[PDB]
Every structure is written in C-alpha cells, then in structure tokens.
Ligand binder design. Structure first.
Ligand SMILES: OC[C@H]1O[C@@H](O)[C@H](O)[C@@H](O)[C@@H]1O
Ligand SMILES: [Ca+2]
Ligand SMILES: [Ca+2]
Ligand SMILES: [Ca+2]
Length: 404
C-alpha cells in the first residue's frame, strides 16, 4: 500500500487562521481514508504568496501559510496517524532579498545570523544575464524568467542546500521531497540533492508539452512524452534512487480519453499509455494539481468526469496522489476512500499487474492482479467481459468496481 495526498491548492495561503491550523482538522479524515503521504507547500519565506518565489529559505515563519511552530504541530499530527510528510522543494531559482553594488537584486539572505545561503551573483548562472555577474557556471536546465536561476554546479550551493534540506527533516519533520520545476536542472543535479538527503521518496515535476493533433487534441502515441520521463528517472539512479516522477503522460492522455475516447488508454503493447505502463513504481499518477486545476486551471480535468479518474488511478498500477479540493470540497469524500480501501483491501500497489479487458471509446474495463476489475465510461452494459467470481462493489457516476 502507498498513496499520496496534495494537502493544499492555489488559494490555501489566504486561509483565515493559517493553512496548517485549519489542516490539523483534516488529519484523521486523511489518515483514516488510506493516505500514507502528504504533500505540503513551500514552507519558506517567498516573495510571492503561494511560495514558489522563495528567498529567505530558513525563514519559515514569514510564510503566508503558517510558521515553524505550526508546521511541526501539523507534521507531528500526521506522524501520529502514521502518515509521512513531504516538502515542496523549490531550488531551480530563488529571489535575492536585497540590492547589490549595481542596483540589480542579487544579494541573497539565507534567513539566519550567519551567511548561510547569503550568496551573491556568483551563485547565479552566468547565462541568466539579467542578474548574473558572468562568473558562475552555465544553467544546467531550463530558465525561469521571473527570477534568478541558481548555479547548481556551484560547490557552495550544493553544500548549503543539502544542509538546509537536511535541516527541514531534522527540525520540522519532513520525510520526502517534491521537486518543483525539475525541468530547470539536469537530473544529474537532482541526484546530488536526492542522495545527500535521502528522503523516503522524491517525486519531481518534469512537465514538457504533449504532442498534439492539428485539432488541439493530444496525439495517440505518447511514447516520446513518457520516454522523457522514464529517462529523467534513468539518469537519477533509477532502481536505486529515491526519486520518481509525476505521470504527466497519464494526465494528458486521460484528459482526452474520458471524453468518449477511452480507446486512448492502451498502447499497441496491451499496456497503459502513461509512465504507468513502462515504469509503474516511479510514476505518481494524479487527476489535477495546483497548476492544472484549482484556480490556475492551466490544464483542468473534465469536471463532470473527475471521479472516472480516481476510479482509474486509485486502482491501477502506479502511485496515486489525491487532490485536496477533490477530497473535501467536491462532494466525493466517501466515494474516494472507498476505493483506496479496495486498493488496500486487495493488497494492490505501484507494481500490481494490469490486464486491460476492454478499451473502446466509451468503455474501459480492466483487471488488476486478477483481484480487482474497474470500468469507467458511459456504456450501461459490459457484463459480457467481467471474469468469473466477480461480485460488484464500489461505483457511481459512470464507473463501477467488482472485487473477486
Ligand atoms: O510548473 C512548474 C512550476 O512553475 C512555477 O513557475 C509555478 O509558480 C509553480 O506553481 C509550478 O509548480
Ligand atoms: Ca544570514
Ligand atoms: Ca531566471
Ligand atoms: Ca535553471
């Protein structure tokens, strides 16, 4: 068993009383439901609210989310119900607290009395001219316009950062990492960090565009899209690494399939289309996150089919991550934990076997480990293909479940 849970959305920082405090009230519900890991936002002080524009890294208190006290207060409740804690680690770029000799904002403040993380333009890639001094290394990954990109090839940086990371665990309680904007630095670099801080798991956010038909729809063969993920995992230690990646491949394909095109959920090999069917133990599947859904909606899921997804991800191979809004604010609390249970009751995991039984545009049926069968889609009958000794069980709005 192993299930993740993103414990926040875009709007979270606004939360009257502090996000963590209101969350203390969702601990048992999440735990009892079957979750095992929770993903909390960037705890650090951030120029921006949501925290993806970090500066004073050790400055936990400044957070719009809550402070050091409450974060622990909250991570400990989780640990009390046996759920691990993940920290949204944002290090591809960073904002300098103050102005240097030139007027350009490149003098950083770590957040403590010493000079830890009190870096200068020297820790800014020389190719991010808008801030650099031209003396650092070259960016090892994508750049982020909005702010100074840190030169991770920098001896000091990899040092003070692991120390900072190691502190997050040793002080607050964090267990695992969720690497923000991983497309910003070579996997070679994530590896430095992952290994010298060894989290129970490190899921990264590598998000490339999906190839699309002239008509806006995503193509059917997404092999290239997912080969770029199993590869990034490849270059990071793979089998022996704590790192894993969100199955963006699955999101794009699934986004288009619930729309009467379930046939898209199978590759010529009889396998799943996302990273799921290639490396199921290194693929974190999901329905929507704080970028793709919520109030940013860069790529939301068909709202009237959001359950067809959970019916899919919470029973298939791969690690499913449940989205906040979805569990507490959409009227699906119960429906969701019922599955996690199924997944749990039947000892299903990241690597269970998958046996697609039907992949027609309006009907997708499957058998996982020959203990569970799920069908999503708008087609009243499929009795025709449901192995022997399968009693019905969980179901609802265009999805059904039969356990042996
Ligand atoms: O998409 C990668 C990341 O890009 C950043 O610019 C956004 O602020 C984050 O919310 C997002 O996780
Ligand atoms: Ca300092
Ligand atoms: Ca930049
Ligand atoms: Ca970068």
């Amino acid at each position: 068993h192993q299930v993740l849970f993103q414990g926040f959305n875009w709007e979270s920082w606004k939360q009257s009383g502090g996000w963590y405090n209101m969350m203390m009230g969702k601990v048992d519900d999440i735990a009892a439901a079957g979750v095992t890991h929770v993903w909390l936002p960037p705890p650090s002080h951030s120029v921006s609210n949501e925290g993806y524009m970090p500066g004073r890294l050790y400055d936990i208190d400044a957070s719009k989310y809550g402070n050091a006290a409450e974060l622990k207060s909250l991570i400990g409740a989780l640990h009390g119900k046996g759920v691990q804690a993940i920290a949204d680690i944002v290090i591809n770029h960073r904002c300098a607290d103050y102005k240097d000799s030139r007027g350009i904002a490149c003098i950083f403040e770590g957040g403590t009395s010493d000079g830890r993380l009190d870096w200068g333009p020297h820790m800014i890639c020389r190719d991010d001219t808008k801030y650099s001094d031209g003396t650092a290394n070259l960016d090892t990954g994508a750049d982020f316009a909005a702010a100074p990109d840190i030169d991770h090839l920098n001896d000091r940086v990899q040092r003070e950062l692991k120390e900072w990371l190691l502190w997050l665990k040793s002080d607050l309680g964090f267990d695992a990492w969720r690497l923000d904007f991983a497309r910003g630095y070579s996997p070679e670099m994530a590896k430095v960090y992952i290994d010298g801080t060894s989290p129970s798991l490190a899921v990264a956010e590598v998000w490339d565009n999906m190839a699309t038909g002239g008509d806006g729809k995503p193509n059917y063969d997404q092999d290239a899209h997912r080969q770029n993920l199993v590869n990034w995992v490849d270059k990071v230690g793979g089998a022996a690494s704590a790192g894993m990646v969100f199955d963006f491949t699955t999101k794009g394909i699934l986004n288009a399939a619930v729309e009467g095109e379930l046939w898209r959920l199978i590759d010529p090999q009889g396998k799943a289309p996302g990273v799921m069917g290639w490396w199921p133990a290194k693929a974190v599947t999901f329905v929507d996150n704080h970028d793709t859904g919520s109030t940013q909606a860069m790529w939301p899921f068909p709202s009237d089919k959001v359950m067809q997804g959970y019916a899919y991800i919470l029973t298939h191979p791969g690690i499913p991550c449940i989205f906040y809004d979805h569990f507490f604010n959409w009227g699906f609390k119960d429906q969701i934990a019922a599955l996690v249970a199924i997944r749990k009751r039947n000892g299903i995991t990241a690597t269970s076997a998958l046996k697609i039984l039907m992949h027609e545009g309006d009907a997708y049926v499957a058998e996982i480990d020959g203990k569970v069968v799920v069908k999503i889609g708008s087609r009243a009958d499929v009795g025709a293909v449901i192995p022997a000794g399968f009693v019905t069980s969980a179901h609802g709005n265009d999805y059904a479940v039969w356990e042996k």
